[PDB]
Design a protein around this nucleic acid. Structure first.
Ligand SMILES: [Mg+2]
Ligand SMILES: [Mg+2]
Ligand SMILES: [Mg+2]
Ligand SMILES: [Mg+2]
Ligand SMILES: [Mg+2]
Ligand SMILES: [Mg+2]
Ligand SMILES: [Mg+2]
Ligand SMILES: [Mg+2]
Ligand SMILES: [Mg+2]
Ligand SMILES: [Mg+2]
Ligand SMILES: [Mg+2]
Ligand SMILES: [Mg+2]
Ligand SMILES: [Mg+2]
Ligand SMILES: [Mg+2]
Ligand SMILES: [Mg+2]
Ligand SMILES: [Mg+2]
Ligand SMILES: [Mg+2]
Ligand SMILES: [Mg+2]
Ligand SMILES: [Mg+2]
Ligand SMILES: [Mg+2]
Ligand SMILES: [Mg+2]
Ligand SMILES: [Mg+2]
Ligand SMILES: [Mg+2]
Ligand SMILES: [Mg+2]
Ligand SMILES: [Mg+2]
Ligand SMILES: [Mg+2]
Ligand SMILES: [Mg+2]
Ligand SMILES: [Mg+2]
Ligand SMILES: [Mg+2]
Ligand SMILES: [Mg+2]
Ligand SMILES: [Mg+2]
Ligand SMILES: [Mg+2]
Ligand SMILES: [Mg+2]
Ligand SMILES: [Mg+2]
Ligand SMILES: [Mg+2]
Ligand SMILES: [Mg+2]
Ligand SMILES: [Mg+2]
Ligand SMILES: [Mg+2]
Ligand SMILES: [Mg+2]
Ligand SMILES: [Mg+2]
Ligand SMILES: [Mg+2]
Ligand SMILES: [Mg+2]
Lengths: 97, 26, 140, 166, 14, 190, 103, 95, 148
RNA sequence: UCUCUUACUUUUAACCAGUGAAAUUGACCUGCCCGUGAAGAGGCGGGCAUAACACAGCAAGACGAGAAGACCCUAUGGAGCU
RNA sequence: ACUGAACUCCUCACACCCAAUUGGACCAAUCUAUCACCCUAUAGAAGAACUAAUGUUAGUAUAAGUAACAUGAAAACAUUCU
RNA sequence: CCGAGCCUGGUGAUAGCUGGUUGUCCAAGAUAGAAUCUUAGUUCAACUUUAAAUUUGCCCACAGAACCCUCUAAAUCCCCUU
RNA sequence: GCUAAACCUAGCCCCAAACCCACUCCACCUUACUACCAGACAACCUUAGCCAAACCAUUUACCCAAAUAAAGUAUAGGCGAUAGAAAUUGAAACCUGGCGCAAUAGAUAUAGUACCGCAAGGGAAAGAUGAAAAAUUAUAACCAAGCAUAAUAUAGCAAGGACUAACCCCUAUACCUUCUGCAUAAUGAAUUAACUAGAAAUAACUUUGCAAGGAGAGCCAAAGCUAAGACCCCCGAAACCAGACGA
């Protein structure tokens, strides 16, 4: 049997949050703040992909270039093997060549 | 557990259907 | 596990509820009930043509029985009844054979008389009357 | 683990009206986790099923199996609780109504076969359930005579209709 | 050749 | 979706711990051929096509499309009788019950987005009022956007705000190609 | 399949057309939502067509409950006692009119 | 053909295509005939004049060479004394 | 993906391979088509029809001289100092029906274009710019922000 | 050893009492003859046979069970040796 | 003369019987934005669907209560005997 | 478990080879060959699928399509109408 | 009705920020966990290979200086698979987070423990009550395979047409895969529960926006430019190399 016997506790969500109410504020800052900032300078994330979409191979290459001088050892080796595998995949296997 | 609400509610309505078919009321 | 499936039991029940009346492990296990329910539905779909064929063969048997009670064969009855322009199909002929035997004796007498008229017309080529229970009604 | 056969003795019916029959007493009792296989225990449970309780004790005192002493203990203490707690007045006036055996929780061991190979030996356990009902034991269903066979055949021939027509 | 495979014991905790 | 970076990641079959040698050699025993544990078939294996790394979803629309969206949303707020334009946001008291009773009396809606400009000339009364309310919001006019205008029922602008909006949004009409980004001098453009 | 479901013989309920024909429908119990997009077709049905439907065949008593529900329903009760409950979840006005006419 | 490079993640050209062919901007590829400087002592002058020609390529071959080269070779160039300048635009075409 | 083989199993040979036969892109002899292509100068054309249109529409204005930076700020030509554009060459495409009376400073000039400017009482002057000075005179304000 | 096997004991074996595996298993309510069929049928065609069910034997069949033939061929697959 | 199809006619409705491949209309579970408030709606997203890989883990069946496995005898439970 | 020990790492080695490849419904949908260390594969042709522009597409009649010795057929191509 | 089934929460993952730790007493390089004695020996060294070139013999990105651009350009290369810059441009200081996982998932982890091997090394499983257990009460029952309640009835892919009746009557050569063709006596599967397989470019189509110009520098342009949607799987070898561990 997979199904649960009792229905779950009620998940109550506050739609008038602090974060939900001011979502999208200081977006659209460049257009009507005479272009002092870009809207991509509002992004808060990893230091390599802040305003950059990328592939899986391209994300790994960019992370190795911008950060891989200060990564941990096992994480750096795993990133090396991932870039090797993804090069072998994208440039040799698949349909549509 | 598997997350979600609709399948648990549907199984609840089936449980009430089976339990009402076992002991029908006067 | 992002978004793994929760309502799998209802699909299992959707297949199994058509297999509660089976025999063996097919009424319980899903891996067996699927193949037997699929074959059951294909048999149910293919059975309609066999139902119509078997019902008409049953009507042919009952009409042959009643006509052979009256000393008539089945082809003589059907042919010489359609030659008097009475268009009764096999269903109502079998129902008249079972439930209204006087009307079936009247129909068998009609078919036998039209048969005799056809035989005398074959010996005489007509000349004079082309029978009486011949002379089809003409529609325009 | 589910223990509902123990809770069946805690049902309490409403007080009966004077213009009613007796409603004979019903006593459920069971012994959990017996070190005995459920099939061999089932053969003894099928032996008892319809008999009276004194005849059940008489057959079980002389049956030469491991489960016979176990079921004799369960039936004796069910007789004792029936006379004491559930207000049966006659000790002899009880018949076995239900008698069955279920699987208990088992353990697993290795069997050490004769190469570097092995099996999974399982240490078997079972239950025994019993239900007593006061009253004389019901008479067995008599085998059907030729009169009943003929009556059912003539009823079958009277039942038929003219199919696939009006 | 002399083809032979050794038996594989399962873990003892099971 | 342009700000979203999802931090989901699972371990592929090369990052799960262990799984080096080939268990039960290829041809001897009667089990299925396997070359490593932690393959995705196994219990405890790595995921075959799981999420990979912190993935970004960044893309930018052309700026004329975003300014057109702002003009469209202002028109939609006007035509459905939702927009209200004030001379100056100033309440007499500065307590929130006055603000919610006024918004109830004028039949605005359950939620309302209040806009002033430049974030420093916002007077103390309206700030002390709506700093406690949960559906009433103050933003400077730089922070106007389609999402907050759709999320709130009405929308309250100011007369310096509507002049600011007309200038900044009409500048996209009658404008050249960039030739370098507009933060650089450009004799007309401040 | 026909071996797996029950079967009945073709019958009238109480010899309808012999004497006078009687409408075999007793009730229609409607449960629609005030807010909620799933009950929009039923909301428009209660707006425009249930008044003419009630005037059309007056043997039937119609109730509209107007209850918060994620799936609106219609319960049709017949003279012989049977109760048929159908869901009008996210349907047109024409589909709901067809459904209550067939009921 | 290195759909994704291992340094910048871009698409690479194969330089043999660039050495042997010429891409006009309209979409056509001009090539040189094979064997045009080999064993001319046994070829007749009609065959020799046929071999020294500049030849357009097929539809499928031009689709192949458009796949094999990046968008730098498909740009519009304005060279000073281009002998193939007039052949870049296309004229009087109809579907 | 089809049935089994190199198609269904993914591993199909590279683009341009022909199953072993010497491929189409290698059977063909080399010739210096794209020999020195990154060192040839390129010149964006500016027809007199386009220059007349720019003069009419309130863009590039004939009362002052017209070097490259007036044409770029008027957005009549898009000059790339990268990709080897050495400025703007003048072009006779709207020679007749050109009455403007300008002076202009271009980098090449055909004979008919010089004539068609000079019949209205104009002056043409043909100047040279190295790519660094292209990059400065085309976009001057990034150079002024550069601080050199 | 055999012509040509026979008798007795023990182990084994059958029943009773206790504990209690392993390979195998698409589902089976699992018959015979002739013919047909991916060329050797319990499941197809024509005939015949036919109340249900335990227990002990035998090995004619289930193209029987264990080991992705170890013999033959292929792989622009390996390895040893000269 | 009759029998004899998914062919044809008859009452009704009609998109509703090909391998690989291609095109199209829908769609369950899950998260998010806004709704909704006995379980749904409009959109975005993806670890998004298992009658089958001698597939992995766990539970229980078949073979099966089958193969196999035990304790020398009497007694006062001191002892004695083979 | 040594024609070259075992463990870890390169390693998610590679494999033109085997196996598998999970919701509903509808529609279209059967291929002359050439090259290739290549016939267990691939590329271009051929067919098929989708979306467009344009006008002719098929069946075909009088006329017509070298010869030479002994015969020399069913037939084929082109082709206005329809 | 037995076996059973159900639970949320330990914790974990990816980031941001910030540079981070280590003697209570005794013992611990000899046979480590040993209080106590005379040859003093001592480290600094181009990776290789699988793999791609459909074989393979030169060749094949992995190298630790932020981004974008120049640019996949100049160059190198059995000039072939592929490798690949540079001159130059510039890179807005502070905010504690999740359209992440929820006991077959997430670190292997309750733990590098149990267990296996001489050694290097390999390496698991699991727990669920309640405010009160100093409340052991009577509930809470309902759901997979497997059994019991409740063995069997002539005939046959287990069903369908049915019928007054379960059977009796008429029809019917299990599924997937590989195949010209499988009921085939060709492969896979005892069953149940959970887990387990389509990742992306150039060029085209559609929908917006602008328009001889498009684009938030770089790039394209004889109706083009920008944005979005849509599209290229899993398991399995014998092998090769490097470094440790073993008489
Ligand atoms: Mg041993
Ligand atoms: Mg590994
Ligand atoms: Mg392997
Ligand atoms: Mg894992
Ligand atoms: Mg684990
Ligand atoms: Mg396959
Ligand atoms: Mg093939
Ligand atoms: Mg060759
Ligand atoms: Mg045979
Ligand atoms: Mg068989
Ligand atoms: Mg065998
Ligand atoms: Mg084999
Ligand atoms: Mg070969
Ligand atoms: Mg080889
Ligand atoms: Mg090799
Ligand atoms: Mg070697
Ligand atoms: Mg017929
Ligand atoms: Mg038809
Ligand atoms: Mg997954
Ligand atoms: Mg999945
Ligand atoms: Mg499953
Ligand atoms: Mg096997
Ligand atoms: Mg499986
Ligand atoms: Mg025994
Ligand atoms: Mg046996
Ligand atoms: Mg024995
Ligand atoms: Mg002994
Ligand atoms: Mg592989
Ligand atoms: Mg079709
Ligand atoms: Mg091959
Ligand atoms: Mg190779
Ligand atoms: Mg290959
Ligand atoms: Mg775990
Ligand atoms: Mg069950
Ligand atoms: Mg039969
Ligand atoms: Mg066949
Ligand atoms: Mg095969
Ligand atoms: Mg074959
Ligand atoms: Mg088979
Ligand atoms: Mg095979
Ligand atoms: Mg098998
Ligand atoms: Mg020794």
């Amino acid at each position: 049997i997979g199904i649960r016997l009792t229905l779950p506790p009620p998940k109550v969500v506050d739609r008038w949050n602090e974060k939900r109410a001011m979502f999208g504020v200081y977006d659209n800052i460049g257009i009507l703040g005479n272009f002092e900032k870009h809207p991509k300078e509002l992004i808060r994330g990893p230091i390599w992909l802040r305003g950059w979409k990328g592939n899986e191979l391209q994300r790994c290459i960019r992370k190795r270039k911008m950060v891989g001088s200060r990564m941990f050892a096992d994480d750096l080796h795993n990133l090396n093997k991932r870039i090797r595998y993804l090069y072998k995949h994208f440039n040799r296997h698949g349909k549509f060549r | 557990v598997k997350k979600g609400f609709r399948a648990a509610f549907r199984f609840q309505k089936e449980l009430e259907r089976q339990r009402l078919l076992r002991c029908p009321p006067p | 596990l992002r978004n793994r499936v929760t309502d799998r039991y209802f699909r299992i029940q959707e297949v199994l509820k058509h297999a509660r009346h089976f025999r063996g492990r097919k009424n319980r296990c899903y891996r067996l009930a699927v193949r037997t329910v699929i074959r059951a539905f294909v048999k149910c779909t293919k059975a309609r043509y066999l139902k119509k064929k078997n019902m008409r063969t049953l009507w042919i048997n009952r009409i042959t029985a009643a006509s052979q009670e009256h000393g008539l064969k089945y082809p003589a009855l059907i042919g010489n009844l359609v030659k008097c322009q009475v268009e009764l199909n096999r269903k109502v002929l079998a129902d008249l054979a079972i439930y209204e035997p006087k009307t079936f004796k009247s129909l068998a007498a009609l078919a036998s008389r039209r048969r005799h008229e056809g035989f005398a017309a074959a010996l005489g080529d007509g000349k004079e009357p082309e029978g009486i229970f011949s002379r089809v009604v003409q529609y325009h | 683990i589910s223990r509902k056969w123990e809770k069946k003795n805690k049902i309490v019916y409403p007080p009966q009206l004077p213009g009613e029959p007796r409603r004979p007493a019903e006593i459920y009792h069971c012994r959990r986790q017996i070190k005995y296989s459920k099939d061999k225990m089932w053969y003894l449970a099928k032996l008892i099923r319809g008999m009276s309780i004194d005849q059940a004790l008489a057959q079980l005192e002389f049956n030469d199996k491991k489960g016979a002493k176990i079921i004799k203990e369960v039936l004796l203490e069910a007789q004792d609780m029936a006379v004491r707690d559930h207000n049966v007045e006659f000790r002899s006036n009880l018949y076995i109504a239900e008698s069955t055996s279920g699987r208990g929780q088992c353990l697993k061991r290795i069997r050490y076969h004769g190469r570097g190979r092995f099996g999974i030996m399982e240490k078997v356990y079972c239950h025994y359930f019993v239900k007593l009902v006061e009253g004389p034991p019901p008479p067995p269903e008599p085998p059907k005579t030729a009169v009943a066979h003929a009556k059912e055949y003539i009823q079958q021939l009277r039942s038929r209709t003219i199919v696939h027509t009006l | 050749k002399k083809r032979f495979t050794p038996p594989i014991y399962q873990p003892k905790f099971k | 979706n342009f700000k979203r970076i999802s931090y989901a990641k699972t371990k592929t079959r090369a990052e799960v711990r262990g799984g080096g040698r080939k268990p039960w050699p290829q041809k001897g025993t009667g089990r299925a051929r396997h070359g490593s544990i932690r393959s995705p078939l196994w219990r405890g294996g790595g995921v075959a096509h799981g999420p990979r790394g912190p993935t970004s979803y960044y893309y930018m629309l052309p700026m004329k499309v975003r300014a057109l969206g702002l003009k469209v949303a202002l028109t939609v707020k006007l035509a459905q009788d939702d927009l209200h334009i004030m001379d100056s946001l100033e309440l007499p008291t500065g307590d929130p019950q006055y603000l919610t009773e006024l918004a109830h009396y004028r039949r605005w809606g359950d939620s309302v987005l209040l806009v002033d400009l430049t974030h420093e000339e916002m007077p103390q009364s309206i700030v002390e009022a709506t700093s406690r309310l949960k559906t009433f919001n103050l933003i400077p006019a730089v922070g106007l956007n389609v999402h907050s205008m759709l999320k709130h029922q009405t929308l309250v602008l100011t007369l310096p705000t509507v002049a600011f909006l007309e200038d900044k949004l009409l500048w996209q009409d009658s404008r050249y190609r960039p030739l370098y980004p507009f933060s650089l001098p450009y004799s007309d453009f401040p | 399949t026909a071996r797996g479901t029950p079967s009945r013989f073709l019958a009238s309920v109480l010899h309808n057309g012999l004497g006078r024909y009687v409408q075999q429908l007793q009730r229609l119990s409607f449960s629609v939502s005030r807010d909620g997009a799933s009950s929009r077709g039923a909301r428009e049905f209660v707006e425009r067509e249930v008044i003419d439907f009630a005037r059309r065949n007056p043997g039937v008593v119609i109730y509209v409950n107007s209850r918060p529900c994620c799936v609106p329903r219609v319960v049709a009760e017949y003279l012989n006692g049977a109760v048929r409950e159908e869901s009008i979840h996210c349907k047109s006005v024409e589909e709901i009119s067809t459904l209550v006419q067939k009921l | 053909l290195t759909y994704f490079s291992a340094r910048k993640g871009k698409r690479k050209t194969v330089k043999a295509v660039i050495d042997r062919f010429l891409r006009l901007h309209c979409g056509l590829w001009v090539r040189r005939k094979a064997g045009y400087k080999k064993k001319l002592w046994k070829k007749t002058p009609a065959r020799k004049k046929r071999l020294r020609e500049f030849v357009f390529c097929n539809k499928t071959q031009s689709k192949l060479l458009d796949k094999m080269t990046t968008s730098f070779w498909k740009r519009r160039n304005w060279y000073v004394d281009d002998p193939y300048q007039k052949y870049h635009d296309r004229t009087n075409l109809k579907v | 993906r089809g049935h089994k083989g190199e198609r269904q199993r993914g591993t199909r040979p590279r683009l341009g391979f022909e199953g072993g036969q010497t491929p189409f892109y290698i059977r063909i002899p080399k010739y210096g088509f794209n020999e020195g292509h990154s060192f040839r100068r390129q010149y964006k054309p500016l027809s007199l029809n386009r220059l007349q249109y720019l003069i009419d529409l309130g863009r590039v204005d004939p009362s002052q001289p017209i070097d490259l930076t007036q044409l770029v700020n008027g957005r009549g030509v898009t000059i790339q100092p990268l990709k080897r554009d050495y400025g703007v060459q003048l072009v006779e495409e709207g020679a007749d029906t050109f009455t403007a009376k300008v002076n202009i400073e271009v980098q090449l000039a055909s004979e008919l274009a010089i004539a068609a400017i000079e019949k209205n009482g104009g002056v043409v002057t043909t100047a040279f710019y190295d790519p660094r000075s292209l990059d400065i005179v085309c976009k001057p304000v990034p150079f002024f922000l550069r601080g050199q």
